[PDB]
């Protein structure tokens, strides 16, 4: 098993244990990157109302290592977390927070009632929107929905209504949604493993940067660039 | 002009099994409950939506 | 969204006076325009207000046949007169503009001018 | 054209809030598509709801444009201090010849 020597663990105390999250409006976006995620904090930890992944399984998460994490965070009423997934519609689904349908990762998500409920009215959402969202777009915009120009009124509105989140109500008590958007070039976040000994001119059971299959491993004069991670044969096999 | 369950420019890429033109005339005030979810002397008790 | 409206003034009893509000921001031609008072002290007093295209009037009773209202959508703007202005009638009227239902109440609302009879 | 409102009402900080406000006649209903209003002193009145429940965009969203039995009313889910203000109703009847109510007082204990 061979990773790079990174004893630096990912930020998601960052994004999990944040004291503030964004509207689902205006969703926020942290990119991790040269660090090691330990996913089974997160895959263990009683916290979580819901662990969800689509195109990964939850618990490969630590063998598998990725070209570049994104962490989507936002909170959303309890009966919206469901829109939160590949394949689906609805008021977040369509203007608020898009997933593709082809999503790779993990959506995690946990009940935040003590915390965030008062009324909270800081966490917006838009009500009204001109057109559907496309995958990971987020875009602010004041602009009255229809023809009204500049006036709101009947049968024109400002885009954004809030929520109202109080300690007394489960579908609409306010949930944490954290996103993890895996990119699958150079290895940039690994899982906890540690690297073994490198053992050559055997045939071993190998793992380079999340790569695996068998084979033996020699020393070669392969010109590789400077730039280049990995090579390919002339049947584009590694 | 005012429609409810559809669209005021769909009417005419639309199509309906029947349609039934109810006519009337009414006072001004009263041209409010002339639509669904409305209450009143016309609404609850000449001509309910 | 900006309603501008003056024409305020301190005024003698039995006489008249004319007020205006002119739009900015906004189209004129396409709401309703209100006019409201209030009494020092007291509360709001509905005066009056007109269609979009002026083809239409309305009045609280207590000032019809006393208030008249005009427009001019090439200016963006409305007047309104009072006639036979009472001492009773001392009052800061408010421009205010109808983008409801029925339009006949304001959503945006001006600074307010000042009117006293003395 | 009558229209009557509760004089005035005091809520305390983080504290839930009625205001009502009724014509002398029938029910109040969508039909009269309800407004209500905010004052402040030194400033003009400002709408915060119309069309019975429309809010608009400059009101907290800790007020709602809801209905009670027959009445209208302007509720909120927790007054602080900077909500101390007269607020006013007003209904439409036969035509755009609204009345006002008398105003409700709140303010915040």
């Known amino acids: 098993v061979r990773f790079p020597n990174i004893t630096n663990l990912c930020p998601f105390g960052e994004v999990f244990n944040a004291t503030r999250f964004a509207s689902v409006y205006a969703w926020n976006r942290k990119r991790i990157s040269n660090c090691v995620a330990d996913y089974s904090v997160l895959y263990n930890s009683a916290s979580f109302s819901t662990f969800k992944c689509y195109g990964v399984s939850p618990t490969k998460l630590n063998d598998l290592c990725f070209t570049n994490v994104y962490a989507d965070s936002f909170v959303i009423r309890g009966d919206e977390v469901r829109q939160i997934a590949p394949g689906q519609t609805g008021k977040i689904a369509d203007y608020n927070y898009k997933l593709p349908d082809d999503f790779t990762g993990c959506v995690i998500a946990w009940n935040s009632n003590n915390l965030d409920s008062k009324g909270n009215y800081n966490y917006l959402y838009r009500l009204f929107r001109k057109s559907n969202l496309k995958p990971f777009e987020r875009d602010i915009s004041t602009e009255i929905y229809q023809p009204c120009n500049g006036v709101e009124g009947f049968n024109c509105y400002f885009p954004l209504q809030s929520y109202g989140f109080q300690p007394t109500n489960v579908g609409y008590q306010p949930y944490r949604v954290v996103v993890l958007s895996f990119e699958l070039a150079p290895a940039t976040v690994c899982g906890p493993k540690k690297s073994t000994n490198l053992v050559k001119n055997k045939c071993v059971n190998f793992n380079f940067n999340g790569l695996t299959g068998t084979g033996v491993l020699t020393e070669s004069n392969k010109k590789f660039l400077p730039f280049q991670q990995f090579g390919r044969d002339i049947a584009d096999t590694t | 002009f005012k429609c409810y369950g559809v669209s005021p420019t769909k009417l005419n890429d639309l199509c309906f099994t029947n349609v039934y033109a109810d006519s009337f005339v009414i006072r001004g005030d009263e041209v409010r409950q002339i639509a669904p979810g409305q209450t009143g002397k016309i609404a609850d008790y000449n001509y309910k939506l | 969204v900006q309603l501008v409206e003056s024409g305020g003034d301190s005024v003698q009893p039995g006489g008249s006076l004319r007020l205006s509000c002119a739009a900015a921001?906004?189209?004129?031609?396409?709401?309703?325009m209100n006019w409201v008072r209030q009494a020092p002290g007291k509360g709001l007093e509905w005066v009056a207000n007109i269609k979009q295209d002026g083809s239409e009037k309305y009045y609280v009773d207590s000032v019809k046949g006393r208030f008249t209202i005009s427009r001019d959508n090439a200016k963006n703007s409305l007047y309104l007169q009072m006639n036979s202005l009472r001492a009773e009638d001392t009052a800061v009227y408010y421009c205010?503009?109808?983008?409801?239902?029925?339009?006949?109440?304001?959503?945006?609302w001006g600074q307010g001018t000042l009117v006293t009879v003395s | 054209a009558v229209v009557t409102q509760e004089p005035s009402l005091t809520v305390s900080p983080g504290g839930t809030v009625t205001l009502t406000c009724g014509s002398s006649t029938g029910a109040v209903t969508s039909g009269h598509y309800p407004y209500w209003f905010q004052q402040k002193p030194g400033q003009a009145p400002r709408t915060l709801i119309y069309?019975?429940?429309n809010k608009h965009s400059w009101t907290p969203a800790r007020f709602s444009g809801s209905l009670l039995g027959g009445k209208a009313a302007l509720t909120l889910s927790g007054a602080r201090p900077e909500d101390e203000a007269e607020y006013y109703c007003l209904l439409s009847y036969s035509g755009a010849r609204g009345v006002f109510g008398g105003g409700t007082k709140l303010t915040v204990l």
């Open positions: 921001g906004f189209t004129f031609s396409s709401y309703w």
């Open positions: 205010a503009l109808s983008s409801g239902y029925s339009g006949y109440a304001g959503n945006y």
């Open positions: 069309d019975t429940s």
